[PDB]
Design a protein around this ligand. Structure first.
Ligand SMILES: C[C@H]1c2cccc(CCC(C)(C)O)c2C[C@H](CO)N1C(=O)Cc1c(Cl)cccc1Cl
Ligand SMILES: CC(C)CCC[C@@H](C)[C@H]1CC[C@H]2[C@@H]3CC=C4C[C@@H](O)CC[C@]4(C)[C@H]3CC[C@]12C
Ligand SMILES: CC(C)CCC[C@@H](C)[C@H]1CC[C@H]2[C@@H]3CC=C4C[C@@H](O)CC[C@]4(C)[C@H]3CC[C@]12C
Ligand SMILES: NCCc1ccc(O)c(O)c1
Lengths: 57, 341, 282, 228, 128
């Protein structure tokens, strides 16, 4: 129990001194990546059945 | 009290409260407030276009290939079948020495498949063989627990997840664990490699996810938002976010740079656990397989569900989106795989 | 007046039979998990037999009884062959189903190893070809007739010969099968009840048998009540020709055909079948 | 082009017919999972039946029995690997009195498992000779561990062996009913428990498992046809 | 993050009555079956008392039957164990454990080495 406790304390000190960004900016990055690929997502914008490899014959 | 155990317990709580304060400090807003002005994706009702049958028992893992056409599935009838999803033909049927299998991967080069389970062994199979038939090439030993997930980085290095509460990065040729990841208290159930191979996350039964540096072997960030065992994990296509599903009937989206949960996807009519999660190509759609025989498609920005996949007759055990985004596949305990788009 | 009432009742019966059997067939065709079980092939064959009844024999006979005369003419000789076949394709199916169940309850280990889909196809083929052999072969050669309107009077020898093959053998087999299954179920019920009573007595420190009896009584008695009076009349009436009028014979024939209507309720309300019906119907 | 389509079609044909030969083999194998605490007679029972796996035949009926012993002690996530097994053989030591409460708790957790609702359990109450030794010695009495034993009455259906002390009969039928009180509390005819008194030299365990599997499949078919 | 803290317990003469309180955070307390287990020196973990989702059903081991009581409160999110007429063999470290999954009557929480949802525990000693 003494070895797992010494390892646990140093792991938390490393994770505490990380630098985090604002959620507003973190969400703003998601907004840019979403609409930058919206027109290329076949599951969002359905592709016509002519260019769909799973509905052709 | 001087007793070094009480001093570690005190510094433990001190760190947990510094972490909770530094986490609520950056929670100036919520993802829902941010995405309230977006337009909804609308109703998405995809339908089963193909059905891949043959398996005699419950399926547990699948992984699309880089070619976006073939995929491998592992069932506990002792088989590992590779399918050509375009023509519904079966390309390979690999019998396994141990019938208890829980995961399977498909190398990004399409040259190798991997799989493992209660035998505590990761087995690699070479699809490019010179005698004719796919057979065993390598077999990774060392774990004291079962094997829950594995994914290739390249043809020589592969990372595994195990029930011995550890993950490991392997050198396929030498068979040596080139890197060990320890720190989880409960069984690690799933891992997901970032799209750029540099980092990867893991979800364990200690209701926690951990970000691991592949080449350095250290845990960078630990998230604790789920109330129970993490069953699935998957990176956002961008690489700085991922979603998890757990037995507490909830999905949660975490960001790497903000180091906390951003949004939670749940409904009070959902009580059963979550078995698999995966994002679309743009990350706007999150597909999840459930114990309630259905697969729910969520709008990753608005928490609205945009469709259901009620086509399996037993718990949906696995799922996966193609690399071209053209379709998603679902494996269940009804011994059937189904393609949707 | 009475004619309209009889017409409405006959149409109700025909539509009920068609609805039940087409629902069973559609639930089998659309949903492949029902088709997976080997024991469901017999239920499919029974439903097909009853649908063939309701398509090939019941409507024309109903029209003839409404009008009071046979309007189809030369179809009569064909119809009396469709009547013997499809009807015999029902009873011979039920017996097979009964036999099937006795193989799944008396020797459970054998059943799963020996009852391959090829064996199910063999049994179904034997039933459906014995029906054809007993119906079409003598009718075309005019052996059923003893030596406008449709003459459905069977020969004195052919009545007994066809009855013993269509009902009396498949009722004796069915009765011995179901009484053996009853004995097995009673043994099991007593075995469970011993442990249950022991557990109750430790905690302190007939429903199962009734429902077994109810299920067996339904499955056997509905079939016997629908068929047996018709077949005893079929045996005695050619000898008579005390005696019975043609109307009584007709109503007992309708009792015989009503088994095809009642079969989907009894032999095809499983949990899976009920779920399939609920999903498909809406 | 079209030739690669015909080669893929005949590769699928060879695959599906190999899986067809494999289906007949898999359909006739009765998988049996062996579970229970350590210091039990489970491993000795497997040794007698002639490690991880065991394959044995009774009257042309194949069984494949597996014990999960190379794992850790968290029996939670891997339990769902045995939702389709024919039966679970739970092995218990009848002479240990506190080890036995652990066995009762494990039996309760197995019987009410969300993924084992239809898995019947065969309970082996091993080491009956040692149990008789302890009861006749009278140094460690069941009432100190199970006070219910003071008010326990020997069942009227009990079949003691020739010369068996009524104290031993009451003790082993008392352990029998603590496990039947769990199995009948929520089984509701979906699955059953079949207790058996065993000793380390007993060699009729293989026959008993065969009879219990016969009864399991009989009561599955009877419930399937709505009789039982 | 799942959090369970046991409180109460200590040196007491045999026959005394003492209440332990397990405080829970990080989950909806109403959805989880709860257990009170203990580990005496020189032996492994053993189950002592069990309480269901709503407190309708409770269970105890035969060793402590008739003295130990288990009572949960979902409103204030806290478990409690009351001991009366303590015995010299009741000296153990008491753990409050959460059954692993919601909406389930299953518990696999007597694991000796590591369980992810049990508290640190408190020392309860009975001596004269
Ligand atoms: C399943 C049934 C059957 C029914 C119809 C047709 C066939 C032939 C199939 C073939 C061999 C040609 O491939 C068979 C096989 C075999 C022939 O011995 N059998 C049976 O024993 C039936 C049976 C008995 Cl007697 C006793 C206890 C259980 C059972 Cl199930
Ligand atoms: C006029 C008569 C001869 C028509 C033929 C009736 C018989 C031979 C046909 C009609 C319906 C058919 C069944 C239709 C459905 C199934 C289920 C399928 O999975 C296997 C074939 C099987 C079991 C068929 C067996 C043969 C069958 C019963
Ligand atoms: C003809 C009418 C009454 C329908 C009869 C169907 C049943 C009773 C017939 C048709 C096929 C027959 C079976 C064919 C195969 C076997 C296996 C053999 O080792 C014993 C006889 C046995 C078991 C026969 C028993 C009776 C049987 C099942
Ligand atoms: N309406 C006659 C129906 C019928 C069915 C079977 C027979 O064997 C038979 O002689 C007559």
């Amino acid at each position: 129990s003494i070895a797992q406790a010494r390892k646990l304390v140093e792991q938390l000190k490393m994770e505490a001194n990380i630098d985090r960004i604002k959620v507003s900016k973190a969400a703003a990055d998601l907004m840019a990546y979403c609409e930058a690929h919206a027109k290329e997502d076949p599951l969002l914008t359905p592709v016509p059945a002519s260019e769909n490899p799973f509905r052709e014959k | 009290s001087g007793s070094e155990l009480d001093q570690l317990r005190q510094e433990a709580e001190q760190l947990k409260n510094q972490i909770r304060d530094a986490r609520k400090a950056c929670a100036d807003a919520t993802l829902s407030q941010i995405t309230n002005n977006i337009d909804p994706v609308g109703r998405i009702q995809m339908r089963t276009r193909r059905t891949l049958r043959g398996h005699l028992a419950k399926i547990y893992a699948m992984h699309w290939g880089t070619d976006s056409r073939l995929l491998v599935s592992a069932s506990q009838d002792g088989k590992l079948i590779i399918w050509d999803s375009y023509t519904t033909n079966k390309v390979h049927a690999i019998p396994l020495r141990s019938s208890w299998v829980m995961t399977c991967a498909y190398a990004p080069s399409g040259n190798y498949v991997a799989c493992g389970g209660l035998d505590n062994i990761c087995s690699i199979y070479n699809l490019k063989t010179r005698e004719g038939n796919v057979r065993v090439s390598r077999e990774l030993a060392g774990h004291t627990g079962y094997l829950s997930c594995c994914r290739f980085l390249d043809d020589n290095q592969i990372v595994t997840s195990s029930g011995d509460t550890t993950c490991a990065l392997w050198d396929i040729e030498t068979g040596q664990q080139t890197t060990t990841f320890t720190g989880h208290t409960g069984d690690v159930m799933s891992l997901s490699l970032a799209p750029d191979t540099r980092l990867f996350v893991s979800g364990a039964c200690d209701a926690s996810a951990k970000l691991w540096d592949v080449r350095e072997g250290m845990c960078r960030q630990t998230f604790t938002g789920h109330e129970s065992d993490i069953n699935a994990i998957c990176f956002f296509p961008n690489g700085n976010a991922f979603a998890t599903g757990s037995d507490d009937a909830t999905c949660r989206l975490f960001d790497l740079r903000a180091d906390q949960e951003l949004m939670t996807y749940s409904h009070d009519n959902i009580i059963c656990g979550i078995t698999s999660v995966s994002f679309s190509k743009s990350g706007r759609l999150l597909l999840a397989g459930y114990d309630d025989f259905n697969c729910n498609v969520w709008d990753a920005l608005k928490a609205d569900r945009a469709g259901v996949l009620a086509g399996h007759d037993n718990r949906v055990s696995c799922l996966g989106v193609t690399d071209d985004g053209m379709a998603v596949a679902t494996g269940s305990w009804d011994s059937f795989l189904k393609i949707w788009n | 007046s009475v004619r309209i009432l009889t017409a409405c009742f006959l149409s109700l019966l025909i539509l009920s039979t068609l609805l039940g059997n087409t629902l069973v067939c559609a639930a089998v065709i659309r949903f492949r998990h029902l088709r997976s079980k080997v024991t469901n092939f017999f239920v499919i064959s029974l439903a097909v037999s009853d649908l063939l009844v309701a398509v090939l024999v019941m409507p024309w006979k109903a029209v003839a009884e409404i009008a009071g005369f046979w309007p189809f003419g030369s179809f009569c000789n064909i119809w009396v062959a469709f009547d013997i076949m499809c009807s015999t394709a029902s009873i011979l199916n039920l017996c097979v189903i009964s036999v099937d169940r006795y193989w799944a309850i008396s020797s459970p280990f054998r059943y799963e190893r020996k009852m391959t889909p090829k064996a199910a196809f063999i049994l179904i083929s034997v039933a459906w070809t014995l029906s054809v052999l007993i119906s079409f072969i003598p009718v075309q050669l005019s052996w059923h007739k003893a030596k406008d309107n449709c003459d459905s009077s069977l020969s004195r020898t052919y009545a007994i010969s066809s009855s013993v093959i269509s009902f009396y053998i498949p009722v004796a087999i069915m009765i011995v099968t179901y009484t053996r299954i009853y004995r097995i179920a009673q043994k099991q019920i007593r075995r469970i009840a011993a442990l249950e009573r022991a557990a109750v007595h430790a905690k302190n420190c007939f429903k199962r048998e009734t429902k077994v009896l109810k299920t067996l009584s339904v499955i056997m008695g509905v079939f016997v009540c629908c068929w047996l009076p018709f077949f005893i009349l079929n045996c005695i009436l050619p000898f008579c020709g005390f005696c019975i009028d043609s109307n009584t014979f007709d109503v007992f024939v309708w009792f015989g055909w009503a088994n095809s209507s009642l079969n989907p309720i009894i032999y095809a309300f499983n949990a899976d079948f009920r779920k399939a019906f609920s999903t498909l119907l809406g | 082009q079209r030739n690669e389509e015909k080669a893929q079609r005949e590769a699928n044909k060879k695959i599906e017919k190999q899986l067809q030969k494999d289906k007949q083999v898999y359909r006739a194998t009765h998988r049996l999972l062996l579970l229970g605490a350590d210091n039990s007679g489970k491993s000795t029972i497997v040794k007698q039946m002639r490690i991880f796996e065991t394959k044995f035949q009774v009257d042309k009926v194949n069984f494949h029995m597996f014990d999960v012993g190379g794992q850790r002690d968290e029996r939670r996530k891997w339990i769902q690997c045995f939702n389709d097994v024919t039966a679970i053989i739970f092995v218990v030591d009848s002479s240990d009195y506190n080890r036995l409460q652990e066995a009762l708790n494990l039996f309760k957790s197995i019987w009410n498992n969300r993924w084992l609702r239809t898995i019947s359990v065969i309970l082996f109450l091993n080491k009956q000779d040692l149990l008789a030794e302890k009861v006749l010695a009278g140094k460690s009495k069941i009432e100190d561990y199970f006070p219910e034993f003071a008010r326990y009455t020997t069942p009227e259906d009990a079949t003691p062996e020739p010369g068996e002390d009524p104290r031993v009969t009451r003790a082993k039928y008392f352990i029998r009913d603590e496990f039947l009180r769990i199995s009948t509390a929520s089984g509701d005819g979906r699955h059953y428990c079949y207790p058996h008194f065993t000793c380390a030299v007993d060699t009729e365990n293989a026959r008993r498992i065969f009879n219990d599997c016969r009864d399991i499949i009989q009561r599955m078919h009877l419930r399937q046809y709505e009789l039982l | 993050q799942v959090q369970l803290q046991e409180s109460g317990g200590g040196l007491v003469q045999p026959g005394g009555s003492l209440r332990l309180s397990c405080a829970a955070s990080g989950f909806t307390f109403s959805n989880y079956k709860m257990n009170w287990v203990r580990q005496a020196p020189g032996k492994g973990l053993e189950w002592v008392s069990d309480i269901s989702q709503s407190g309708a059903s409770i269970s105890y081991t035969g060793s402590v039957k008739g003295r130990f009581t288990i009572s949960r409160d979902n409103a204030k999110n806290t478990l409690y164990l009351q001991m009366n007429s303590l015995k010299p063999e009741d000296t153990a470290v008491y753990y409050c454990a959460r059954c692993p999954a919601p909406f389930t009557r299953d518990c696999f929480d007597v694991t000796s080495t590591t369980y992810a949802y049990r508290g640190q525990g408190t020392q309860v000693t009975v001596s004269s």
